[PDB]
Amino acid sequence: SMESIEIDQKLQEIMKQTGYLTIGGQRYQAEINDLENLGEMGQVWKMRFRKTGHVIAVKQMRRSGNKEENKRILMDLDVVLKSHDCPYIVQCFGTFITNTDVFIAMELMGTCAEKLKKRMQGPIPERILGKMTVAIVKALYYLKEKHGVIHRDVKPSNILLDERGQIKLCDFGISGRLVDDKAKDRSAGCAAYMAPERIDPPDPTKPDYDIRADVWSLGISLVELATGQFPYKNCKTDFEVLTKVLQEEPPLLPGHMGFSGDFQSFVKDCLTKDHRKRPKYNKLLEHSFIKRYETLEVDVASWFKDVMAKTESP
């Protein structure tokens, strides 16, 4: 099975570099006992590496665990390692093994955009969202252009922030390799952020979708974070949400709040219903919203720290 060969092939490549953490410009030999457990994050554990004091995120892959779940963890790990040089994607410090487990050390961030939304109990400021848009669109473009990967789960819980003001994309466990710029897997992703063409393919003989589906998910995420509410929150079921995505006009930023013209334009472009007219990432990167925020000095770090200091855990 070519699925079996590449999975063991990738596993071998990773096992060759196991037994050490590269953190702070130094390579350290590493075992489970070198790591103090500090509790789960709803398996992903927050752990202190005793040799340096760094607090990290630790994923646990079981030998006797769910086969589909271990495939996702290996897929996520593979994409993370390949994406080392992209600064908008979380970093892995290394792996180490027991007889029964593979532990994976990841960069601990502060929190996700979904949790920030809950802490804010309202909007995240346009200036933060502008930096976020730049970062996430560059991460997704990087995955597409350099690895032929479609993320398939762009949503606020996968956008991370830290106290240094970095914004990064994470969780590629359901990411797919594109074939001729197309993906086939119709079950991969969260229903609420699905584009119209993924819910109901316009051509039932050619049902496959591409990165433009993720562009829609980005748009929905931006409206959600900019207003403090998921646009279809008052739908009583997932089936109702999807029915509205199909039948109604797309959500927009509401004009009465005074969002800048270029942000309104960007969201409106991302939320073009007809996927043939929806821009790809290379076109989004030319958008004046992005150009404005690429160069703009925004103190995301101070804003982040202030929010985390002033609010309770959701």
Write out the residues near Na ion by the rule CB under 5 A: 83, 86, 89, 91
Give the separation between CA 154 and CA 219, rounded to whole angstroms.
10
Please work out, in degrees rounded to the nearest 5, the angle formed at the alpha carbon of residue 263 by the alpha carbons of 132 and 192.
65
Q: Based on CB atoms, which residue is closest to Na ion, 13 or 181? A: 13
Cβ at position 183, least distance to Na ion in Å: 22
Which entry of 153, 171, 210, 214 is annotated as an active-site residue?
153
Q: Is 80 exposed, middle or buried (0-12, 13-18, 19+ CB in 10 A)?
A: buried
Residue 241 · residue 232 · CB < 8 Å: yes
* Binding annotation: 41-44, 59
Cβ at position 85, least distance to Na ion in Å: 6
Q: Is 190 exposed, middle or buried (0-12, 13-18, 19+ CB in 10 A)?
A: middle
Q: Based on CB atoms, which residue is closest to Na ion, 89 or 271? A: 89
Q: Is 153 a catalytic residue?
A: yes
Concatenated DSSP letters for 119-165?
HHTSPPPHHHHHHHHHHHHHHHHHHHHHH-EE----SGGGEEE-TT-
Q: Based on CB atoms, which residue is closest to Na ion, 143 or 242? A: 143
Cβ at position 108, least distance to Na ion in Å: 14
* Binding annotation for ATP: 41-44, 59
Residue 190 · residue 205 · CB < 8 Å: no
Cβ at position 84, least distance to Na ion in Å: 5
Q: Based on CB atoms, which residue is closest to Na ion, 151 or 212? A: 151
Give catalytic residues, as residue numbers.
153
